[PDB]
Amino acid sequence: VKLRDLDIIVTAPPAPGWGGRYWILVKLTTDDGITGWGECYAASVGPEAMRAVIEDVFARHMEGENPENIELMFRRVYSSGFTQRPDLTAIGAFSGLEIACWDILGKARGRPVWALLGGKMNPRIRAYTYLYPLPHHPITPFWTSADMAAESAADCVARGYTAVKFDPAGPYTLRGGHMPAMTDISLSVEFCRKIRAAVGDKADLLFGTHGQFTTAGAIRLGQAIEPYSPLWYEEPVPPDNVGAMAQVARAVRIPVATGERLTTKAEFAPVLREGAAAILQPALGRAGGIWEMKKVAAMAEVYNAQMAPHLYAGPVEWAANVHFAASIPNILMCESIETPFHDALIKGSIRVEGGYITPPEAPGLGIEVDEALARANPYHGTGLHLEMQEASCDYT
């Protein structure tokens, strides 16, 4: 078969909007009518600019191609316009389209995507979630309340989650790395202490930092939270300096996790080689798609390192994560977001049950995308999927 048609749907999750301001869905159709769904993860520019980028990438490198030719299509986009180094925006476009190709391939083969990726390694995939406000928690105060976070952790654990994520360490800003305030450090310690007291040995603590810090700052914060045995320390520094992250990794006793803002094996390889991270967290809708991330997973294997696929986006990218995770021996866990809208968008096709995800057995990604629901929920705002503060860190 040959790829023929592209539809792009930008959809806005209802309030409180866990998973960001909008999700960029792509729907591909072959010349014989098979449809595949994918999801792009790219917000350097807004959704309208992303539409033009996606349409270009598809028309230029993919339209009329056999969807089997995943290596070739990656090379075309990766090399586009005499580049042949990672383009964060163009590869974001490609990744979503590549995921749709896998959905198509599974349907054409009559097999789930994982069955095409070296088969099943994992009959059940360990899941985790951020700590989100419970219904009685005021949303804004929740983010700096250790007490409320501990309640959310207790509820996650009751529900079967074996790991929970939180970031009490303060705002990320556009200036780059900063030194944490003493209050950021003490709050981070309070969170770890209270969450550990609430979950005991029943769950791991995932310290979900957002690249806020200088190397110096990341080390000072890291050392303070060591006594609570967090399973990982995520993005301790901004994503533009592998050497700086390896410095943090060598100086703190907590495993460093990173990858959500990185793209292609050309960026993941140095992270491993320099010892910057032990746990890789690519967003498949950003990092080059399923096949490219299989290449990265194999690289992680020879460093005795593991994958933990990123999710702060919709259930389509999450379905890609699940098939990917089902097929690799070095899976740690899959980030997950439980909301009515996430579930409804794929008609409950794949779910976290008792803290774990069972790989679907249906063909392709094993999802039924509610296209009507996505279209009934357009994005009207002027913001990006996520945004970085302009105001500096508060020391007063």
Catalytic positions, written as ranges: 210, 310
* Binding status of residue 387 toward its own copies by CB under 8 A: yes
Exactly one of 4, 69, 80, 86 binds ligand RIB (CB under 6 A); that residue is 86
Minimal distance, residue 91 CB to ligand RIB, in Å: 10
Cα distances from 228 to residues 206, 224, 236, 292, 380, in angstroms, run 11, 9, 17, 35, 43
Contact 394, 180 (CB under 8 A): no
**Site size for ligand RIB (CB under 6 A):** 10
CB of 277 to ligand RIB, least distance (A): 10
Residue 344 CB, shortest distance to its own copies, in Å, is 26
Helices of type H across the chain: 47-57, 70-79, 88-109, 139-142, 146-158, 182-199, 215-225, 242-251, 265-273, 284-287, 290-301, 315-326, 340-345, 371-375
As measured in angstroms, the least distance from the Cβ of 116 to its own copies is 7
Q: Scanning residues 47 to 106, which ones bind its own copies (CB under 8 A)?
A: 48-49, 51-53, 55-57, 60, 66, 68-72, 75-76, 78-90, 93
Environment class of residue 362 by beta-carbon count within 10 Å: exposed (0-12), middle (13-18) or buried (19+)? middle
**How many CB atoms are closer than 10 A to CB 91?**
27
**Encoding tokens for residue 260?**
């959500």
Give buried/exposed letters for 98-121 (b at 16+ CB in 10 A, else e): bbbbbbbbbbbeebbbbbbbeeeb
| 239 lines the binding site for ligand RIB (CB under 6 A) | yes
| Identified binder of ligand RIB from the candidate list 267, 292, 317, 335, rule CB under 6 A | 267
> Of the two residues 276 and 346, which places its CB atom closer to its own copies in the complex?
276
CB 41 within 8 A of CB 20: no
Of 9-17, 26-34, 373-381, 382-390, the window that binds its own copies (rule: CB under 8 A) is 382-390
Percent helix, strand, coil in the chain (nearest 5)? 40, 15, 45
Residue closer to ligand RIB, measured from CB, 195 or 262? 262
CB-nearer residue toward ligand RIB: 276 or 369: 276
Look up residue 394 and give its two tokens.
Answer: 């508060």
**237 is an interface residue for its own copies by CB under 8 A:** yes
Residues 377 and 165: their CA atoms lie apart, in Å, by: 28
Choices 36-44, 316-324, 339-347, 371-379 (CB under 8 A): range interacting with its own copies: 36-44
Q: Which stretch binds ligand RIB (CB under 6 A): 33-41, 89-97, 263-271, 357-365?
A: 263-271
Buried b (16+ CB within 10 A) or exposed e, 282-308: bbbbbbbbbbbbbebbebbeebebbbb
218 binds ligand RIB (CB under 6 A): no
Residue from 33, 81, 85, 390 binding ligand RIB (CB under 6 A): 85
**Candidate ranges 66-74, 186-194, 234-242, 307-315; the one touching ligand RIB (CB under 6 A):** 234-242
Any contact of residue 90 with ligand RIB (CB under 6 A)? no
Distance in angstroms (rounded) separating the CA atoms of residues 101 and 2: 10
Closest contact distance (angstroms) between CB of 262 and ligand RIB is 5
- The window from 40-48, 93-101, 265-273, 311-319 that contacts ligand RIB (CB under 6 A) reads 265-273
Helix axes 265-273, 290-301, angle to 10 degrees: 10
Q: Which of 145, 330, 336, 377 binds its own copies (CB under 8 A)?
A: 330
Q: How far apart are the first and last CA of the chain?
A: 62
Read off the DSSP letter of residue 389: B
Distance of closest approach, residue 42 Cβ to its own copies, in angstroms: 8
List of residues contacting ligand RIB (CB under 6 A): 85-86, 239-242, 262, 266-267, 270
